[PDB]
Amino acid sequence: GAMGSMERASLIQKAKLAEQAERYEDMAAFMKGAVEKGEELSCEERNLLSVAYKNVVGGQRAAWRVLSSIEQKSNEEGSEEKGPEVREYREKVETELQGVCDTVLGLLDSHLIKEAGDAESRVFYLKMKGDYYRYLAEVATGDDKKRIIDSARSAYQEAMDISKKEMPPTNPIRLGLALNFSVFHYEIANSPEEAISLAKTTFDEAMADLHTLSEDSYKDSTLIMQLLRDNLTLWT
Amino acid sequence: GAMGSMERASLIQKAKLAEQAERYEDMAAFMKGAVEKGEELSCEERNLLSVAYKNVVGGQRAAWRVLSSIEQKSNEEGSEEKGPEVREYREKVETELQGVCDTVLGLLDSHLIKEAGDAESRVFYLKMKGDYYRYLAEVATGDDKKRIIDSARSAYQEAMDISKKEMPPTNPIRLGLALNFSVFHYEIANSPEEAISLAKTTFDEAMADLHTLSEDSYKDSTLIMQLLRDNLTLWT
Ligand SMILES: O=C(COc1ccccc1P(=O)(O)O)NCc1ccccc1
Ligand SMILES: O=C(COc1ccccc1P(=O)(O)O)NCc1ccccc1
Ligand SMILES: [Mg+2]
Ligand SMILES: [Mg+2]
Ligand SMILES: [Mg+2]
Ligand SMILES: [Mg+2]
Ligand SMILES: [Mg+2]
Ligand SMILES: [Mg+2]
Numbered sequence: 001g002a003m004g005s006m007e008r009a010s011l012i013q014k015a016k017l018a019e020q021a022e023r024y025e026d027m028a029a030f031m032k033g034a035v036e037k038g039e040e041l042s043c044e045e046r047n048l049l050s051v052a053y054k055n056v057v058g059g060q061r062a063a064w065r066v067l068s069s070i071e072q073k074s075n076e077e078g079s080e081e082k083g084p085e086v087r088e089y090r091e092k093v094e095t096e097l098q099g100v101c102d103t104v105l106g107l108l109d110s111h112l113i114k115e116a117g118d119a120e121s122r123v124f125y126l127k128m129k130g131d132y133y134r135y136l137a138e139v140a141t142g143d144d145k146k147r148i149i150d151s152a153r154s155a156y157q158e159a160m161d162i163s164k165k166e167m168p169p170t171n172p173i174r175l176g177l178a179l180n181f182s183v184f185h186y187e188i189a190n191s192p193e194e195a196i197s198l199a200k201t202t203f204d205e206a207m208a209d210l211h212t213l214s215e216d217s218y219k220d221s222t223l224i225m226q227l228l229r230d231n232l233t234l235w236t
Numbered sequence: 237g238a239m240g241s242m243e244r245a246s247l248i249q250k251a252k253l254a255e256q257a258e259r260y261e262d263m264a265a266f267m268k269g270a271v272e273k274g275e276e277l278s279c280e281e282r283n284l285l286s287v288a289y290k291n292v293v294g295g296q297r298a299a300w301r302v303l304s305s306i307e308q309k310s311n312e313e314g315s316e317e318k319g320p321e322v323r324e325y326r327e328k329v330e331t332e333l334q335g336v337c338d339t340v341l342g343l344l345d346s347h348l349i350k351e352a353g354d355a356e357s358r359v360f361y362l363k364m365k366g367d368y369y370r371y372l373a374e375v376a377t378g379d380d381k382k383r384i385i386d387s388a389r390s391a392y393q394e395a396m397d398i399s400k401k402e403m404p405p406t407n408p409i410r411l412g413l414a415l416n417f418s419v420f421h422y423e424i425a426n427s428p429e430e431a432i433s434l435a436k437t438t439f440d441e442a443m444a445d446l447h448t449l450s451e452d453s454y455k456d457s458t459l460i461m462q463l464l465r466d467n468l469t470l471w472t
Contacts (some may be wrong), residue, residue: 013321017306021299024328063257080428085249093259 003033008082011037015048023108024055028100035107040115046124053104057135060097064139067093094139100130106133119166120173126159129178130184149188169205170213170221178202179227186235196235199228238348239269240300247273251284260291264336271343276351284362289340293371296333300375303329311458330375337368355402356409362395363413366420373424385424406442406449406457415463424469434469435464 011034018027035041041049067090073079074086108129115121133142133152140148158179162176178198186195206213206225210218239247247270254263269284271277272324277285303326307316310322344365352358369388376384387456399410414434442461446454 010319010321013318014325017303017322017325020306021302023299023328025324026328063259067253070256082249085246085247086253089250089253089262092262093257220359 001033001036003029003036006033008034012045015052020154024051024052024059028052028056032103032107035112036128038111040121042110042130043120050105050124050128051134053100054146056161057097057100057104057132059137060093060100061083061135064093064097065089073089073121081204097139098136102133103138105129119162123163123167126155126162127173127180129181130156130159131180134166134188150177152184152188156184165218168212169202169209171222172224175202175221175224175228179224182228182231186231192235196232199232201236203232217220237272237293238270240263242272244270244275248281248284251288254460255284255287260295264288264292267337268343271348272323272364274347276357277348279356282357285441286342286360286364289368291334293336293368294339295369296329296336297374300326300329300333306332319350333375334372337372340368341365355398359395359399359403359409359413362391363409363416366392366395367416370420370424371417388420388424404448405438405445407452408456408460410436411442411457411460412462415460415467418464420466422467428471431469435471439464439468 011030015027015030015034018024020032024036024222027048031052034045035049050081067086071090074082111127113122113129116125130152133155133172135150137148137152156177159177163171163177167174179202182199182202183196184195185191185198203225206221210221213221216227237249242250250265251266251270253360254260254266255299262282267281267308268286270281271285303322307322310318344361349358349361349365352361366388369384369391373381373388374471392413403410414461415438418431418435418438420431421427421434439461442457446457449457
């Protein structure tokens, strides 16, 4: 552990500085170090962890998509062969992406999830587990892919079950979970009808609970409701 | 050398793929490997080297500026102390930036510059040498800073002398060199009058040579002339 000699609070402070500097690889390493101190994470600290790795893996996913599309064009009728380079480099990026996902999943399994007893922390971590298996699924091929997809589905489902019992329908954690599980259904599981039904039921049940919220909470919830509606517009 | 086992042509191909994927750290490592094969670089290959390291160091400069400004606020009248973290992290980024600059300068010195006999390659490499000493100067403090500034000035000046003898006034390499040397004068050397005079003389002498150019070359030259005029507007 390269961050083993740095104070937990210093790691959190530096993660925040790295976010400001848009240094997301540094931010992720600092938050990994904070997690490995072994104490539970606060709401703010959980969000820092999520922001850091979402940005890192997002860059890798974008690059992998560019490279995979070049690779697929290179393996089409009428292409003159270029040799192994495109495949090799896509494999390099893919391997780096898988390693980031494995790192996050390792943090959740050792030992964030098992110590998370409150609904807000447990749903948050289980949503993350679903997300990073979903990113693994995006680059997986074969039976391989089926066990990874089922791991994503299981994590999302446990998170959904808890959120429906323990959180109101406008809770932003609950809404963001349903948003991402709906994307899983549409993009990974080949279940567009399940995706649309989940996004619609989630939107409608939040709409009916908005009257209970303050102005600030209303803004938080309607923001994510708009993302659900954007997807339904794209999907229907 | 981690790229010692990869073919030169494969390194160039992968640099181009990395550019497409906006993976500039990879692009720079691939081009470093290509340079270390020991053969001279073509015009296209020189541009790939420059693009890669400009993007890498640009990210570091942007982050260093964010962190240094936070550090300066933290050391002002009325700030409550936060401890060593801001300084430590700015120093980390600074050290990483200096290492990238040192790497580029090492490639130029071993042995790109000494083998560059044509005006287009020699001016290109000497401009690069001025640029990466200028980036070192931006974070340097003290006497330290004076020797680094003089190294930047010397490189830019040798490049200017060659470009004035060997290239027409609209040559994009010559124009980009004059642009960057003018920025050196304004931002590093505390010589705004020298900056303005150089940018104005460079613009006016290119304007008078535009009639000699094709439509495509006219577009290339006027693009950089606009950058010179943008700076003069900012500076006067
Ligand atoms: O189509 C997508 C999906 O985005 C969404 C949308 C809604 C919820 C979650 C995600 P997700 O957790 O990010 O998938 N693209 C995102 C992307 C892809 C490549 C690089 C960077 C970002
Ligand atoms: O003020 C500048 C100077 O830009 C110019 C302008 C004209 C010529 C060269 C440069 P330069 O070789 O890039 O300095 N900002 C650039 C920057 C700073 C931080 C991060 C990324 C980019
Ligand atoms: Mg301690
Ligand atoms: Mg693979
Ligand atoms: Mg249902
Ligand atoms: Mg060979
Ligand atoms: Mg220093
Ligand atoms: Mg003069």
